[PDB]
Amino acid sequence: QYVRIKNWGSGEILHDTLHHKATSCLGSIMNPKSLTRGPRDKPTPLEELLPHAIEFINQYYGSFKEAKIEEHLARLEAVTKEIETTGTYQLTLDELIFATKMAWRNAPRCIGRIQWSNLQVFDARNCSTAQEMFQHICRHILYATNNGNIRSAITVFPQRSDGKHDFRLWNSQLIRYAGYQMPDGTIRGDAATLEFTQLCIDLGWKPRYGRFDVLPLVLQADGQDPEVFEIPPDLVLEVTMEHPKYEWFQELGLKWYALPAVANMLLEVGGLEFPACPFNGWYMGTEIGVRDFCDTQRYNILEEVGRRMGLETHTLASLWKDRAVTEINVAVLHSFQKQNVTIMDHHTASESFMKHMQNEYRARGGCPADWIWLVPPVSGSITPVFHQEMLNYVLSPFYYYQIEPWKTHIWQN
Amino acid sequence: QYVRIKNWGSGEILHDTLHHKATSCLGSIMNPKSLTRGPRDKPTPLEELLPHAIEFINQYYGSFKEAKIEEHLARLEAVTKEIETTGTYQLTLDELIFATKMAWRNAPRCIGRIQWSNLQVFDARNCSTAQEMFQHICRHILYATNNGNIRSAITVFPQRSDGKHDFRLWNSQLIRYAGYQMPDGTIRGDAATLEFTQLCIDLGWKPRYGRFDVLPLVLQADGQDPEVFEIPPDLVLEVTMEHPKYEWFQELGLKWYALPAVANMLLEVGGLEFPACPFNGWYMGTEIGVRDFCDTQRYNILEEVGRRMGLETHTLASLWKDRAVTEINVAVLHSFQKQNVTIMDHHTASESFMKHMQNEYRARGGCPADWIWLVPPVSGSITPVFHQEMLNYVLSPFYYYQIEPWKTHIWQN
Ligand code: HEM
Ligand code: HEM
Ligand SMILES: C[C@H](O)[C@H](O)[C@H]1CNc2nc(N)[nH]c(=O)c2N1
Ligand SMILES: C[C@H](O)[C@H](O)[C@H]1CNc2nc(N)[nH]c(=O)c2N1
Ligand SMILES: O=[N+]([O-])c1cccc2c(Br)n[nH]c12
Ligand SMILES: O=[N+]([O-])c1cccc2c(Br)n[nH]c12
């Protein structure tokens, strides 16, 4: 019938029926196969493609306020013919737009989903070369940034045909800092991008050997070898970190790019797969302040900010780590707000998601949600999301992870 | 072969093989059936009991440094005879001790598991009346408290025979505060214990209508009706909350009991079930400071502590909630330390668990772990546990949840 869901903070109860439409214990696995859509060397079998296509065409037309039956049946016929005569089909622009938003709506790990219907779509399915890709990605970055007034957008490249002509971005994110394995045993920049920074070098990128060196776009088009392209500095907007009280904070010489843009995910819709569809929204403070700046595998600036504050950084029970991390978060929020760059704190983000969740249950009886990702990296139980029981399931359309390109790519020269 | 586990903070990899011995997507469900062992009206079927018994007897003897084969085979024979002639069997004291520690060792939701081998066991299997139960529980509380130098202990009551003579504690925890639905629409005390506080009243308990009113032990013995017993105040040690800087903190008039003792769980071992086996360890600061004091469904003192600090408690982006919660945590840790009562901060707890996890993988190739519970309610990613991929599975011996007694109990008079 349905699965009962309870919120322990407010006591509210919800009835999840949406999970019945799911596709298919692995507790806290980061990249499980269930969330990964790998490569192919052959086209999608027709017996599989068609049911998926029809099911999507039904979902699309069944989403209008007032149904348009005539067009619905006609699209059903045309789609079938297209598959019969070409082996695959082309989505109409409206269907693609609808698909990108739904896939976002169905992202279990996204806290910003209340914004799902507000997405700019850049149709780059006609694209054919890396240079054209690069031009599209620049247009994206420029539009999305909007001089600090960040706008959510997505750029869709040509769908996978036989799997040997995949368009792919080798970058994890569009804008991302380089990480170098410095001489003195240390690490410079972003330690998370170590292996990738090297790959860029192995392809002719000039390592400016620093701290906040924006890495280059590594683009693969039509299954061909990846080409390195440096991002025009004018396009990369950054925020300089300043604390509203600790003047010594700017002495840390920290900053971060204002554009969070996922670049390596695959968009699945109606049997079709889009191995290249970079998308972005805006930042949530804790991502920068807590994960980027404080993870030990990242910038790891925690102890340092502790000392400058004069905390007993040698006694854990003093809760010094709790103290520093909050000041860093305050810095981030203050800096973005001052420099007129869109930012959202985790508390406001949570309430926003909660409101969204409630809208989703009223609108379609469910909201796929991954508690482990939806709960902020700090002040967990202080946010409403923590007390909300959730159901994690994979719907369609959906944004899947992909196997890293350098592991499967067959080189030409 | 095995499941690969990775820690994203340190990069370490672990191979989980222990999950193969497990008994048997529900994301963040609080009380799932997989963790609940319900009631019975008939004895455990022999075809089921015996394999479970033999398997436990093998585990027990197979845990010694140097095996004692002779005794092992003899116990196997005797156990079989006992089941053949009585329909069930009695654990030896050593086996029970071993079982209680293993079940703790196998508690996926416990962060304090590094202490698993340090458990005092009180054999109360000979118990037969509520008065005797009450006396045992008092001896427990007194021993465990040890005048602030908290000691981990467990008291085992008679095992379930036919399910119609179950020994059960109706209390969630041994020491717990009452919650009253005051006149003025508000709530007094602990809002979590509302329904239960009433039940105590419906059984003759005198509602002292306050804030920190220690509730009474509601004991069910031999399947008979529950009897109410007030806990001797001298036994209940408490800590008064004091901030080392904000002198106005004591004006809040807050405190908390120093003894965290789970009272409603069922111990499962070798086919046998113990519906009454209260146990305790020591507190982890955030439990009191964050959950008990700050959950909106609990004491909800967050805004109040914010005001006293002079924070913009009307602007979420100011991160005022993050500020208050940390001071409360500092208060708790400071108070317990000052009053010489055992307490542990969440940072030290995490490192402790991490060390434990590593010992467990080296010792037996696994450690059942529930990430959702193991990660502190604040400073999530700041703790090592957050970056540790985990596997959640149910082993045996194990501590299960039970269906609340008032929902299934058949009243006599
Ligand atoms: C408008 C503001 C948005 C905010 C504040 C937001 C925030 C976030 C956050 C905090 C995460 C977790 C990231 C991490 O920890 O690695 C996330 C994940 C995700 N978001 Fe959103 N998001 C927004 C817009 C979008 C858009 C426009 C899309 C897609 C059309 C999207 C798709 C996703 C997906 C697929 C993930 C998973 C990424 C992964 O698994 O690594 N988000 N987002
Ligand atoms: C020595 C110190 C110990 C510490 C610091 C510790 C701490 C904790 C914490 C923080 C939780 C989560 C509680 C909650 O959020 O409701 C927990 C759960 C648990 N602990 Fe430990 N524990 C300790 C000892 C013990 C002992 C001695 C046992 C049993 C023999 C035990 C059994 C469990 C079980 C079964 C749970 C799950 C409770 C539930 O699901 O509601 N703990 N413990
Ligand atoms: C091991 C664990 O799954 C991993 O470290 C997580 C957990 N929660 C997360 N939540 C978010 N938002 N982002 C993340 O990267 C992670 N990583
Ligand atoms: C909904 C969610 O499962 C619930 O609120 C949780 C999550 N994490 C927890 N973790 C601990 N330690 N204790 C808890 O009570 C909970 N409750
Ligand atoms: O805001 N964030 O922290 C954040 C993190 C990771 C991916 C995205 C996207 Br797409 N929008 N916002 C994001
Ligand atoms: O320390 N704690 O926060 C805590 C919470 C809940 C149950 C227990 C036990 Br048993 N020991 N410590 C506990």
Curated annotation (Swiss-Prot), chains A, B:
Signal peptide annotation: none
Full protein: residues contained: 77 to 497 of 1144
Subcellular location: Cytoplasm, Cytosol
The species this protein was found in: Mus musculus (Mouse)
GO molecular function: arginine binding; calmodulin binding; flavin adenine dinucleotide binding; FMN binding; heme binding; metal ion binding; NADP binding; nitric-oxide synthase activity
Known tissue expression: Macrophages.
Superkingdom of the organism of origin: Eukaryota
Name the UniProt record assigns to this protein: Nitric oxide synthase, inducible
Post-translational modification: Polyubiquitinated; mediated by SPSB1, SPSB2 and SPSB4, leading to proteasomal degradation.
Chain sites annotated for binding Zn(2+): 25
Complex and partners: Homodimer. Interacts with NHERF1. Interacts with GAPDH. Interacts with S100A8 and S100A9 to form the iNOS-S100A8/9 transnitrosylase complex. Interacts with SPSB1, SPSB2 and SPSB4. Interacts with ELOC and CUL5 in the presence of SPSB1 or SPSB2 or SPSB4. Forms a complex with ASL, ASS1 and HSP90AA1; the complex regulates cell-autonomous L-arginine synthesis and citrulline recycling while channeling extracellular L-arginine to nitric oxide synthesis pathway.
Gene behind the chain: Nos2
Gene Ontology BP annotations: arginine catabolic process; cellular response to cytokine stimulus; cellular response to lipopolysaccharide; cellular response to type II interferon; cellular response to xenobiotic stimulus; circadian rhythm; defense response to bacterium; Fc-gamma receptor signaling pathway involved in phagocytosis
Record's note on what induces expression: By treatment with endotoxins or cytokines. Induced by lipopolysaccharides (LPS) in macrophages (in vitro). Expression in the liver oscillates in a circadian manner with peak levels occurring during the late night.
Binding site for (6R)-L-erythro-5,6,7,8-tetrahydrobiopterin: 28, 291, 372-373, 386
Consequence of substituting residue 127 to R: In strain: NOD/LtJ
